[PDB]
Amino acid sequence: AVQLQQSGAELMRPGASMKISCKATGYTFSSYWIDWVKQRPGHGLEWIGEILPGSGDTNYNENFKGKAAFTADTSSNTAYMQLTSLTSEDSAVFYCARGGRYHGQGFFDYWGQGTTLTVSS
Amino acid sequence: AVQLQQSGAELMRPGASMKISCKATGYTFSSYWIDWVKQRPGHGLEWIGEILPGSGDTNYNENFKGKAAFTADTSSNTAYMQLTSLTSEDSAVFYCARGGRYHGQGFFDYWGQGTTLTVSS
Amino acid sequence: AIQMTQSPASLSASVGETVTITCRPSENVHIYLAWYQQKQGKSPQLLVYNAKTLADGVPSRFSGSASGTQFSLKINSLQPEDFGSYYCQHFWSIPYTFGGGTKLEIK
Amino acid sequence: AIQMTQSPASLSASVGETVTITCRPSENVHIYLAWYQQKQGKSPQLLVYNAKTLADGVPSRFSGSASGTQFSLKINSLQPEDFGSYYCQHFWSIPYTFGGGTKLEIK
Amino acid sequence: ILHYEKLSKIGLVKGVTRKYKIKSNPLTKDIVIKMIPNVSNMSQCTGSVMENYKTRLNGILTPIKGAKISCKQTELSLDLALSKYLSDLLFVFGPNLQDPVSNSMTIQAISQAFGGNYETLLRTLGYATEDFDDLLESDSITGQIIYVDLSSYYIIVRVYFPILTEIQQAYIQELLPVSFNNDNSEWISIVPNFILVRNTLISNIEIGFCLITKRSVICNQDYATPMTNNMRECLTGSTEKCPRELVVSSHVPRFALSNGVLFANCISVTCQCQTTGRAISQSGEQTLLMIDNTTCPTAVLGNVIISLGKYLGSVNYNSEGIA
Amino acid sequence: ILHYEKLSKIGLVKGVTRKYKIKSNPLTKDIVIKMIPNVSNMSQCTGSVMENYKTRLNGILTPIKGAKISCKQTELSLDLALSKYLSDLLFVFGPNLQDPVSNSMTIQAISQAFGGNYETLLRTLGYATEDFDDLLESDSITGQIIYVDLSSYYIIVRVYFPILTEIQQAYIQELLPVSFNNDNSEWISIVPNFILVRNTLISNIEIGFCLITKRSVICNQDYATPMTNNMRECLTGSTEKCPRELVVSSHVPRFALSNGVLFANCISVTCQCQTTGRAISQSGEQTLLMIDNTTCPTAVLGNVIISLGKYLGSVNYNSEGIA
Amino acid sequence: ILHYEKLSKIGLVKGVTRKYKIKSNPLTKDIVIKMIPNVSNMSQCTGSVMENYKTRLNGILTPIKGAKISCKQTELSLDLALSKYLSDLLFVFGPNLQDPVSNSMTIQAISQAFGGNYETLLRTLGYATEDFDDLLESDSITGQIIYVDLSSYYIIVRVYFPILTEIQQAYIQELLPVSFNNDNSEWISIVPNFILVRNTLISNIEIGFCLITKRSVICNQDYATPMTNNMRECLTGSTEKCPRELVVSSHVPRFALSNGVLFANCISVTCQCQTTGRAISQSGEQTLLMIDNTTCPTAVLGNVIISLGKYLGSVNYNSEGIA
């Protein structure tokens, strides 16, 4: 509610893997889904998946099933996402969003501050 | 079961009646069905009918229905066949057989000796 | 009425040779079948009482087996005392039918 | 997956003008449709989360409407801070599909 | 009369409501079907087409009783007309010929019984617009072959028209038990599945022998039975003495469906929606949870996946454009 | 056995009496239906129609499996001959192609299974004329598509012939409760609706799963359950210990229909006739009425209206006589 | 779960075990039936046949919604083209045109709904191979005519595709009580005919409203009911406390048929074979006697002539051989 800070930008080579983070404070973390939404710099916004911290349930997009993997460290109020098989097309900005508690609440109240995943040779 | 000895042979005129017997011992006489089998040398053995000594139950071959009539005497362990309206075709041998007790046991472990009823003028 | 179709009508073989007689019921009779042995002037003696079972006192040379649709009688080692008439019989349904038989003669 | 048609891609309106942006999903999504405001260097911010309900802290200048397939977002008395990118997103089925986005220009 | 609010709080959800109809002695009409079309008595260029149609009709009718270029063109024209006559006849009265005893009449045969005048049909049979709809979807207007003639080819079919007597003010209500949580334990209520309500009168109904129809219940006789004072008190609202058994060592329904709406127990098991994979909004205001097609087209309960409904697209009938 | 006088005085009505039959394992026959008839070896413009008819059969059968004046005249004549054959084939075996699993048999197909000689069918299968008619009106002679060949277009159709075993001297008697007036209060006697009577043996039966037939009851297995001695004495004639309840606060059957006769209660509620104002009334000594077609064609019972089996006139099926 | 061996000691024969499936809201599709084909653009020899086909079409549709050698030769070719089209269409969809409100879909219509692709059918509707077979043999895929147009002749059939919900491990166990002899007297065990077992959970069920399928039980909603501890104890294996009643002065079932297997009480009544006429051997270890088509194709039980699955030979369709 107050902060959805992400870890800063980082540089990795193509074919490697990376782990993103998002720190959430100001509310009951275990109740609200943290949904990650992707934005390439020139073509709009795209959804990746969601993770429920209090129960560990996760949902994924078809294009990102092998490209994404989530983890929610409730002990430190920190979310996570693992990205694999990174290429130049994976270099984009990844946003952590506070989804609602239940169904019909997929709207995104608060968003991350924004850090850029940079994949290049 | 030990034996199924029968009476002596005989010669009868056409159209008469004659009473075939088969004395059997060595077992509980009422339990096992007594079978009655005819043997014409021109075509082979034929089944006439069966009689259960423990009751009056009889079963008949349809072509032999009007020619055979059985009777059992549990007091003397003797089974009987009464052939009526003897014809020239009955100038053959007739056999008594001890069948099984139940369904699926219509086989004859023990046979009586061959007695040839003769029909001639 | 079911018909016991027994073949061959006559059969000859040498002593000690395996001989096979096969009879076909015109309708299903399950394992419910028998084979009998008889000689001229003698009362028949049962040999096989169910398709795969031998009767009491029968030497092991006699054998019977049920095929997919046919019943076969086989003597492992034929001997002269095994001659005579061999009738197969069914007892699945009334009337019980005796087959024509196969006269076995030593070559 | 549900597809989202958002038009126009770019929209020009002056100061004090009344402007409206509309989006259509490829299938019925119920009142499940949200509008976000994005500017360069900043995250999108929720404005109208249900079909016709404004989010907390949203100025009253923003409003929305809901139809069977048509969804539109209307801005009254446009102000210079209202420039940026507007996205229309559904949460009816997995995966959640965002719209193409609309770039509003202040004149 | 029934207090559904306090019944909903003990797991009983309103089912389909239906009004009570008793079937009286049916009216009967005799549809004589002259199976030979009125062909011309002229005998040129007809030949054996008449006898071929006669043997074709013989093949149909015997089992029932048992249980030159222009000359050929005239024959062909009359050959196809007889086939069209029979094919049209075998559509209006096909099922009756296929099952001579107790086959349901086609809607064409019902119309042909009154010459296509439904306005007459409703009045002479004393039918309301509802009764005809209920009888049609209950398949109760039947037929029977009572006379087959192999000399002059015709058959007479009884068409039995049931007389649906509707109760003055009786409604058959379906009571659907659903498991509910109480005192941190799962319970289920035991009430009759189908109930009869007519004003203040509540009676048990043994609906099993009747014909359940979307709008009404068709019964060959009145199956109402008296109610116990305790069961009526439960249905009136005093649920404190309504039966309820624990769900231990038994399987109990945790959901019920009514008019396309799902009533669910989400306290005993977790209920989600397969469309989104997230839990459904739940509140302590009600002991049971309601889901409809508006929220989810397919909802999962524990491992029970339930389709709330979904309209797929239309598809054209496919056939070759032979002309 | 049953004492219908004292049961009648307690409001019980004698209903339809049916014989009790058990459905044994059915006999099975196969019907090979070649959908390509034995066409002649001629080739005068017959290939096109043959290919087209094979394509026509493709659409019929794949769902079951997947589950030049002289030249054209012979083309049309043999095409019409093939269409008539398929129309006849689809008349006899159409239902089995539409429902390849567990569809009932057309009566024509039943005759085809035995060459059209119903005497052979009755003798081979053991069917008394009553048993065959009971099966036909219960539609229990079924079929099943077990093989579809697409190279040589033919299908083998199972036809299951249920074996009905008449339980000798066993009758499924139907008891119809009707309310009655006693001691200035209205009562109803609660008894089983269907009762099995076999000699001096009376037993309950749960006839719900059984196929009810006008002359008999076809049950897949025996459903006779022992009768309590109190109920047996109740039905034997000692009616003072039958279960009876007051009608207050509950709806009870005040009428019943038995083989065309309407029994009524007219002391508790007033009854009249539509044709003549109050043509019916109840005497104090009698407990029920006997209303039939002769007395009134339409009986009013309280507010309930009952119309009996009026026979309307005969109608003639109307279609153009093309010639 | 249940101790069937000890249940056989007191007469409970094991019956058919069916999976438990719950019918959710139906999936929905529309099939537009353009009942007029694509006729040729020629008008010299077309109009008369077109008008006759239109009036023939009216004869079908009004009850539904209401509720020159070359020229003649071309005339006949079009006429038979239309007749073949209508004959095939009335085969696929005609059952819906005969019961417009609710009629089961022919398997051709089910295929045409999905372009003849059954893999698409199972994927779109989520049907397993078992679920699709259960629906087809239960006649549950039903269509309804929802539009009739007489200016442009076409109809729309709303195909309802029911969604089944087979429980992960719920089985419907059919229990068939059979009389047994003990203490020189005959007894019958009173137990429910159908019992629901799911893992260690046992529950009663009232299947009178559901559909019986050879592999499953299609209940519109869960009719599971909590089961008494005493009843669970006996079915678990404590057979000493099942309800039992002496068979005196009553009729009880002495024979049960379980998927081609006959269980007989050969102690109270003498059981024989009708094809042979001898009794059947019974070992003292078994309180009930087992018969199959392997041993007897028809067995007499007392005076009850029960028959088993005898199979008769095949037969041809006996076609007319039209060519």
Side-chain angles (χ1 to χ4, degrees):
Chain A
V2 184
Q3 292 189 351
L4 270 71
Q5 293 294 110
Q6 298 169 196
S7 48
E10 51 203 342
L11 273 152
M12 321 65 85
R13 59 149 287 167
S17 301
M18 192 21 58
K19 182 84 156 291
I20 318 191
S21 73
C22 173
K23 173 64 179 289
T25 62
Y27 71 112
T28 300
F29 180 29
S30 58
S31 301
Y32 288 74
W33 298 69
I34 305 300
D35 316 349
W36 282 89
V37 190
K38 186 185 175 190
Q39 176 159 256
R40 58 182 61 74
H43 310 82
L45 242 182
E46 184 159 29
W47 188 71
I48 309 204
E50 53 181 47
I51 173 159
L52 178 59
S55 304
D57 294 328
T58 56
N59 299 295
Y60 284 91
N61 193 353
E62 295 298 329
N63 307 94
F64 286 73
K65 186 61 180 290
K67 308 303 178 69
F70 294 101
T71 287
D73 182 22
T74 307
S75 84
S76 67
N77 297 7
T78 311
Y80 286 99
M81 161 175 48
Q82 187 183 30
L83 298 175
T84 82
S85 71
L86 270 48
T87 64
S88 61
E89 293 85 350
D90 292 280
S91 189
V93 200
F94 295 86
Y95 274 20
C96 65
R98 176 192 194 227
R101 294 192 287 167
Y102 298 118
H103 176 35
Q105 311 192 322
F107 51 88
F108 294 139
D109 307 342
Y110 308 121
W111 291 57
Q113 92 279 16
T115 55
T116 282
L117 205 89
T118 321
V119 191
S120 189
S121 58
Chain B
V2 174
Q3 54 89 21
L4 278 95
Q5 284 289 129
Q6 298 157 220
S7 46
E10 62 284 326
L11 186 143
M12 277 343 300
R13 66 154 285 170
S17 301
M18 150 51 204
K19 186 77 162 287
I20 300 163
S21 67
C22 175
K23 171 68 176 290
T25 58
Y27 67 105
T28 299
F29 183 96
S30 56
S31 301
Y32 296 79
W33 293 63
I34 286 267
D35 276 86
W36 268 138
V37 152
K38 172 183 176 176
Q39 193 169 0
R40 61 179 76 85
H43 305 83
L45 296 161
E46 182 149 22
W47 186 68
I48 302 170
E50 58 186 14
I51 174 166
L52 170 57
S55 76
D57 298 313
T58 51
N59 211 331
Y60 278 135
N61 191 343
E62 295 291 342
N63 311 288
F64 279 69
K65 180 64 185 293
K67 308 299 172 66
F70 305 139
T71 291
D73 179 23
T74 318
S75 79
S76 66
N77 301 19
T78 321
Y80 304 91
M81 169 169 15
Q82 191 173 13
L83 291 178
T84 57
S85 73
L86 269 49
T87 79
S88 72
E89 296 92 308
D90 294 327
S91 198
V93 67
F94 301 93
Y95 289 87
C96 68
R98 169 184 153 280
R101 292 194 288 167
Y102 301 125
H103 173 53
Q105 290 173 18
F107 55 84
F108 324 125
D109 301 324
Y110 291 103
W111 290 69
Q113 93 276 23
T115 61
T116 299
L117 163 66
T118 324
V119 181
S120 181
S121 56
Chain C
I2 323 176
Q3 297 96 351
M4 279 332 95
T5 305
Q6 187 166 336
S7 307
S10 63
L11 195 45
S12 303
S14 303
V15 178
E17 188 64 284
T18 304
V19 64
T20 310
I21 304 166
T22 180
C23 92
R24 285 142 293 289
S26 64
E27 193 159 33
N28 189 20
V29 300
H30 185 226
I31 208 181
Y32 288 146
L33 195 133
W35 293 77
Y36 301 80
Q37 170 176 242
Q38 185 183 37
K39 284 158 283 184
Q40 184 175 7
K42 308 297 182 179
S43 54
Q45 295 175 358
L46 178 64
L47 297 191
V48 181
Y49 76 71
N50 276 312
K52 294 196 292 275
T53 314
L54 262 67
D56 292 340
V58 177
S60 62
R61 67 183 80 157
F62 294 96
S63 63
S65 50
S67 300
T69 58
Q70 316 193 18
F71 298 71
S72 59
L73 175 75
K74 175 173 66 178
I75 322 179
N76 182 266
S77 174
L78 173 66
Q79 310 206 4
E81 64 270 22
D82 308 324
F83 91 109
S85 309
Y86 284 65
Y87 319 95
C88 90
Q89 176 238 322
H90 95 286
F91 56 67
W92 161 259
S93 73
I94 298 310
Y96 308 144
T97 298
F98 278 83
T102 303
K103 182 61 149 60
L104 203 163
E105 183 173 349
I106 301 310
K107 185 180 290 185
Chain D
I2 289 182
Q3 298 97 347
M4 268 282 216
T5 293
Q6 178 177 351
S7 302
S10 64
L11 190 40
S12 305
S14 309
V15 180
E17 189 59 288
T18 287
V19 72
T20 304
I21 307 172
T22 182
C23 69
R24 290 187 295 283
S26 61
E27 195 169 336
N28 180 14
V29 296
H30 177 64
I31 74 179
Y32 299 151
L33 192 139
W35 286 95
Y36 312 93
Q37 175 172 249
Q38 181 174 231
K39 288 168 286 184
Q40 184 177 5
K42 304 293 183 179
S43 56
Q45 305 190 347
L46 180 69
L47 291 155
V48 170
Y49 64 88
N50 287 333
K52 307 197 303 289
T53 304
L54 266 73
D56 299 344
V58 174
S60 62
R61 70 186 75 166
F62 290 105
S63 63
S65 81
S67 305
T69 58
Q70 293 277 13
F71 299 80
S72 69
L73 184 80
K74 175 172 66 181
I75 325 175
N76 293 113
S77 193
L78 199 74
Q79 310 202 9
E81 64 267 20
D82 302 326
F83 85 107
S85 292
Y86 291 77
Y87 296 57
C88 156
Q89 173 239 320
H90 85 95
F91 41 100
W92 176 250
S93 65
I94 295 290
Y96 298 167
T97 305
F98 280 73
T102 300
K103 205 53 191 31
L104 191 143
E105 180 172 322
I106 299 287
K107 190 187 298 184
Chain E
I1 304 105
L2 271 157
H3 198 156
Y4 304 67
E5 152 83 358
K6 275 152 82 143
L7 290 190
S8 183
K9 284 203 281 223
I10 65 154
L12 300 173
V13 291
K14 204 182 111 173
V16 195
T17 207
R18 296 192 193 79
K19 54 183 91 83
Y20 198 33
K21 302 189 182 182
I22 310 310
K23 214 151 91 173
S24 303
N25 288 254
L27 309 115
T28 67
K29 264 211 176 196
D30 300 355
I31 316 178
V32 180
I33 329 173
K34 194 182 180 184
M35 248 159 224
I36 279 287
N38 231 311
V39 315
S40 181
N41 63 289
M42 96 78 67
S43 62
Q44 177 175 2
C45 289
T46 166
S48 286
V49 61
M50 206 67 228
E51 291 192 333
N52 294 19
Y53 185 31
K54 289 274 189 72
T55 188
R56 209 151 76 91
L57 281 195
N58 274 7
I60 299 172
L61 299 201
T62 305
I64 314 179
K65 306 186 64 178
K68 292 185 180 180
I69 295 167
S70 305
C71 203
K72 293 174 185 289
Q73 278 187 337
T74 296
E75 199 178 319
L76 274 169
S77 180
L78 171 78
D79 231 323
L80 179 54
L82 270 50
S83 302
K84 283 195 310 213
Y85 184 98
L86 193 57
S87 205
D88 292 348
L89 196 151
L90 284 174
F91 178 67
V92 178
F93 303 106
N96 307 301
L97 298 190
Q98 288 181 336
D99 187 20
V101 54
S102 293
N103 211 336
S104 184
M105 281 305 248
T106 88
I107 191 157
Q108 292 75 14
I110 298 174
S111 80
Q112 259 64 85
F114 302 80
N117 228 314
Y118 279 107
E119 179 57 37
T120 296
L121 189 153
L122 265 72
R123 154 181 50 270
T124 167
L125 270 38
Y127 281 155
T129 307
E130 187 184 298
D131 291 346
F132 194 43
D133 293 342
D134 292 342
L135 285 162
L136 279 161
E137 87 180 292
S138 64
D139 217 28
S140 296
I141 291 167
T142 64
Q144 173 166 9
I145 304 295
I146 51 153
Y147 189 73
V148 185
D149 201 316
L150 263 282
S151 301
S152 182
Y153 287 88
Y154 78 63
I155 330 169
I156 304 185
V157 197
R158 301 291 228 212
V159 54
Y160 292 107
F161 292 115
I163 292 186
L164 284 201
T165 285
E166 313 183 53
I167 310 302
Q168 312 313 298
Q169 293 166 350
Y171 289 120
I172 307 313
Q173 192 71 272
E174 195 181 13
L175 289 174
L176 298 187
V178 180
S179 313
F180 66 99
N181 179 312
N182 170 259
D183 295 347
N184 311 311
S185 194
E186 186 174 13
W187 300 81
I188 184 158
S189 44
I190 291 312
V191 312
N193 278 123
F194 296 82
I195 210 75
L196 190 152
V197 182
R198 172 187 177 178
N199 311 358
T200 79
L201 314 178
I202 321 196
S203 34
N204 307 57
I205 183 171
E206 306 300 326
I207 191 134
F209 300 115
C210 301
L211 279 191
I212 282 170
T213 282
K214 186 178 292 184
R215 274 189 163 233
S216 73
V217 174
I218 295 96
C219 297
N220 284 34
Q221 58 253 30
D222 197 350
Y223 293 110
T225 88
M227 202 141 264
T228 325
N229 182 257
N230 194 73
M231 191 59 51
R232 174 185 168 78
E233 258 329 278
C234 162
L235 298 182
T236 311
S238 307
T239 59
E240 61 266 21
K241 46 205 170 184
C242 205
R244 30 189 82 83
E245 316 334 304
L246 275 176
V247 314
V248 68
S249 80
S250 56
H251 178 231
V252 284
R254 264 171 272 280
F255 63 84
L257 296 104
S258 302
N259 61 75
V261 179
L262 202 177
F263 289 78
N265 187 343
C266 295
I267 300 172
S268 307
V269 313
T270 297
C271 61
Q272 309 180 358
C273 283
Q274 184 264 355
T275 318
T276 200
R278 322 159 71 123
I280 272 287
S281 307
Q282 185 172 357
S283 310
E285 188 167 23
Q286 312 102 14
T287 196
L288 253 52
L289 188 134
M290 187 188 91
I291 327 185
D292 48 12
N293 204 320
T294 310
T295 310
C296 304
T298 292
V300 77
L301 292 108
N303 294 357
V304 186
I305 189 168
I306 279 191
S307 166
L308 272 309
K310 175 182 311 283
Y311 165 74
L312 320 177
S314 69
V315 47
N316 294 14
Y317 172 69
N318 184 30
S319 61
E320 186 167 21
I322 311 178
Chain F
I1 312 144
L2 283 170
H3 216 195
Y4 296 96
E5 174 73 10
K6 314 182 91 213
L7 289 181
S8 99
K9 277 139 115 137
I10 305 309
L12 291 212
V13 196
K14 161 184 208 204
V16 201
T17 314
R18 303 170 182 88
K19 310 167 175 317
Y20 191 20
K21 306 181 150 135
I22 305 300
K23 223 204 61 72
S24 325
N25 267 241
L27 304 196
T28 294
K29 266 213 174 197
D30 298 342
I31 313 173
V32 177
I33 51 169
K34 282 183 180 180
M35 311 215 177
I36 306 285
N38 261 132
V39 73
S40 172
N41 61 281
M42 57 86 74
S43 64
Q44 189 171 24
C45 301
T46 187
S48 49
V49 295
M50 210 48 239
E51 287 236 25
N52 292 349
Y53 177 122
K54 285 218 222 128
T55 279
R56 190 178 168 202
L57 286 180
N58 281 343
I60 311 295
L61 301 201
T62 294
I64 319 175
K65 195 59 180 181
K68 294 182 181 178
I69 298 162
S70 304
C71 157
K72 292 178 183 287
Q73 279 200 359
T74 309
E75 188 179 49
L76 286 173
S77 286
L78 179 173
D79 196 13
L80 182 49
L82 273 152
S83 298
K84 289 190 296 187
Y85 174 53
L86 191 48
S87 184
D88 297 344
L89 169 58
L90 284 176
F91 172 61
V92 177
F93 287 111
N96 302 108
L97 302 191
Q98 295 174 184
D99 192 17
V101 282
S102 80
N103 206 348
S104 181
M105 271 285 138
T106 42
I107 196 166
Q108 284 79 10
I110 286 161
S111 93
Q112 304 298 321
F114 282 87
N117 279 304
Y118 285 96
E119 180 68 19
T120 315
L121 200 155
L122 275 42
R123 182 254 301 169
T124 300
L125 272 48
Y127 284 150
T129 313
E130 162 193 311
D131 304 344
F132 189 49
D133 288 344
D134 292 346
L135 279 174
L136 278 173
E137 102 190 67
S138 65
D139 221 25
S140 296
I141 296 166
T142 59
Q144 159 150 349
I145 304 302
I146 47 154
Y147 173 80
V148 187
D149 178 27
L150 264 292
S151 299
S152 60
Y153 288 83
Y154 75 84
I155 293 135
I156 295 186
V157 202
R158 288 290 215 213
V159 50
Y160 296 62
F161 290 108
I163 272 282
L164 299 196
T165 308
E166 306 186 301
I167 302 302
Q168 309 98 293
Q169 285 190 334
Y171 299 118
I172 303 304
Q173 183 74 320
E174 168 159 335
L175 298 167
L176 296 176
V178 176
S179 185
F180 62 99
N181 181 298
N182 194 227
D183 296 344
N184 261 328
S185 297
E186 197 202 310
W187 305 79
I188 182 162
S189 47
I190 285 289
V191 310
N193 276 124
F194 291 81
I195 290 282
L196 168 52
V197 180
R198 183 182 187 250
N199 288 167
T200 194
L201 311 176
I202 300 182
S203 65
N204 296 163
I205 187 165
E206 305 302 324
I207 195 193
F209 304 109
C210 302
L211 291 203
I212 295 178
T213 288
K214 175 179 312 218
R215 278 177 161 259
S216 72
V217 178
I218 296 97
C219 289
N220 232 295
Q221 30 258 61
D222 194 355
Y223 285 118
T225 81
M227 171 155 298
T228 56
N229 184 268
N230 182 80
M231 188 71 42
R232 183 202 164 77
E233 293 294 339
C234 159
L235 292 187
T236 278
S238 72
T239 61
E240 66 306 2
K241 46 197 173 187
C242 302
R244 72 181 74 172
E245 327 299 316
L246 259 174
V247 312
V248 65
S249 81
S250 204
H251 177 70
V252 289
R254 276 175 265 268
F255 65 95
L257 306 107
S258 289
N259 57 80
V261 186
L262 171 93
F263 291 84
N265 186 250
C266 284
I267 292 173
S268 67
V269 297
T270 306
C271 55
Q272 285 100 342
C273 291
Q274 277 286 354
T275 295
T276 285
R278 200 166 192 195
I280 51 174
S281 64
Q282 183 159 335
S283 299
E285 152 151 334
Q286 274 66 39
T287 203
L288 265 54
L289 266 294
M290 245 195 210
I291 298 155
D292 44 25
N293 313 288
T294 309
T295 306
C296 290
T298 305
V300 180
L301 278 84
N303 296 308
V304 196
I305 200 140
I306 285 285
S307 198
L308 309 179
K310 195 172 83 202
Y311 165 71
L312 301 167
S314 63
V315 283
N316 297 53
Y317 160 75
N318 180 26
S319 52
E320 186 171 2
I322 309 174
Chain G
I1 312 96
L2 315 183
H3 211 167
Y4 297 84
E5 174 57 36
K6 230 171 311 173
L7 290 185
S8 190
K9 296 291 172 33
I10 68 155
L12 293 57
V13 202
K14 204 183 93 143
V16 194
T17 307
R18 295 150 175 139
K19 296 172 68 188
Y20 191 22
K21 301 184 183 189
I22 279 191
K23 204 143 64 63
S24 297
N25 250 2
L27 265 277
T28 292
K29 254 182 161 293
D30 294 341
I31 313 202
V32 166
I33 322 294
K34 200 184 176 186
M35 272 195 38
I36 285 276
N38 316 47
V39 74
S40 179
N41 67 302
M42 96 87 68
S43 59
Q44 188 177 352
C45 313
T46 292
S48 312
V49 184
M50 201 65 267
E51 288 177 11
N52 304 7
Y53 184 74
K54 294 269 186 70
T55 187
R56 172 175 187 203
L57 264 191
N58 281 333
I60 313 295
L61 296 190
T62 309
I64 311 177
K65 188 176 183 177
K68 294 182 181 179
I69 291 162
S70 304
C71 193
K72 290 175 185 289
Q73 207 228 40
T74 304
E75 191 178 29
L76 260 299
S77 301
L78 162 53
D79 201 4
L80 185 46
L82 292 166
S83 299
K84 288 194 331 178
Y85 177 36
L86 199 56
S87 298
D88 295 339
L89 186 167
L90 298 182
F91 177 64
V92 180
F93 286 109
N96 297 284
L97 283 97
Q98 288 181 332
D99 187 13
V101 197
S102 180
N103 194 84
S104 178
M105 269 316 207
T106 67
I107 203 164
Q108 288 73 11
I110 289 164
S111 82
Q112 303 274 340
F114 282 100
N117 224 327
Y118 285 94
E119 183 66 25
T120 311
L121 195 138
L122 306 165
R123 184 205 309 130
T124 309
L125 321 173
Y127 290 168
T129 278
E130 189 184 75
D131 301 330
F132 190 46
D133 290 339
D134 301 345
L135 285 163
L136 279 171
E137 89 171 66
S138 63
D139 257 358
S140 287
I141 289 160
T142 53
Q144 155 164 353
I145 274 284
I146 56 157
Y147 192 73
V148 181
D149 185 359
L150 276 314
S151 297
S152 182
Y153 291 80
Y154 64 83
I155 58 184
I156 312 178
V157 202
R158 178 103 98 206
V159 196
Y160 299 68
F161 285 101
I163 283 313
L164 301 179
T165 314
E166 40 189 355
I167 318 302
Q168 290 189 332
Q169 310 204 30
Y171 289 105
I172 289 298
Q173 185 44 52
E174 191 173 350
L175 293 163
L176 321 195
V178 170
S179 68
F180 66 95
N181 204 316
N182 181 246
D183 294 345
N184 305 314
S185 294
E186 186 168 37
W187 310 69
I188 181 173
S189 39
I190 294 316
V191 278
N193 278 123
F194 288 91
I195 220 76
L196 173 69
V197 187
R198 171 185 186 176
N199 288 9
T200 89
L201 283 317
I202 315 170
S203 287
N204 303 138
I205 189 166
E206 296 185 32
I207 310 189
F209 305 104
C210 328
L211 301 137
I212 298 304
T213 290
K214 293 263 272 233
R215 277 177 161 263
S216 71
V217 174
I218 297 96
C219 290
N220 294 350
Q221 54 208 344
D222 191 5
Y223 303 110
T225 322
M227 179 154 143
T228 296
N229 177 271
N230 202 84
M231 256 295 301
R232 171 176 161 81
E233 267 289 334
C234 177
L235 264 55
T236 308
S238 302
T239 197
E240 61 267 19
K241 59 223 296 171
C242 261
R244 64 197 64 208
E245 295 288 344
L246 212 80
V247 316
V248 82
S249 37
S250 176
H251 189 233
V252 310
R254 302 218 188 55
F255 60 98
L257 282 153
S258 295
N259 51 85
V261 181
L262 166 44
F263 289 74
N265 185 356
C266 291
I267 295 114
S268 308
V269 303
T270 75
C271 68
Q272 315 185 147
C273 213
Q274 196 249 355
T275 47
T276 291
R278 314 159 154 277
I280 290 154
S281 57
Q282 186 161 0
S283 297
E285 188 184 68
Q286 278 70 48
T287 184
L288 266 60
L289 185 139
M290 191 205 268
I291 318 156
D292 47 9
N293 35 299
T294 314
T295 306
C296 280
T298 172
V300 317
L301 285 64
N303 34 288
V304 191
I305 306 176
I306 300 301
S307 184
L308 286 128
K310 178 158 43 224
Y311 157 81
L312 304 114
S314 71
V315 75
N316 289 2
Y317 160 74
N318 298 297
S319 51
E320 187 166 325
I322 327 182

